[PDB]
Amino acid sequence: GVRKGWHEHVTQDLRSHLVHKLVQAIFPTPDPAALKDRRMENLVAYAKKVEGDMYESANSRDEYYHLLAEKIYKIQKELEEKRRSRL
């Protein structure tokens, strides 16, 4: 980046990797049918939505990783916690 280099401190792979990780956190088992299912796609789009929201705060390396990771742990806790009340 000569004069245009905002995103440089983050690679595309980082974002896509984390976004898939976010999706994977929500649903780890890669089902070949569900993979081609719209409902999963909505969730994947939701993960990108998260990426968009984070980006403003994410104006620093540590912030960016922490934002995504923290939410993932939150999400994982939610599932286990609520399922505790099953039956």
């Binding site: 909505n42 969730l43 939701y46 939505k49 998260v50 929201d53 939150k74 999400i75 609520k82 399922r83």
Partner: peptide
């Protein structure tokens, strides 16, 4: 509020699904 935490319905999907 872009939804940093996932709403119930999306979360339900994984709970309802079991390979």
């Amino acid at each position: 509020d872009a939804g940093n935490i996932l709403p119930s319905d999306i979360m339900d999907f994984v709970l309802k699904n079991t390979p």
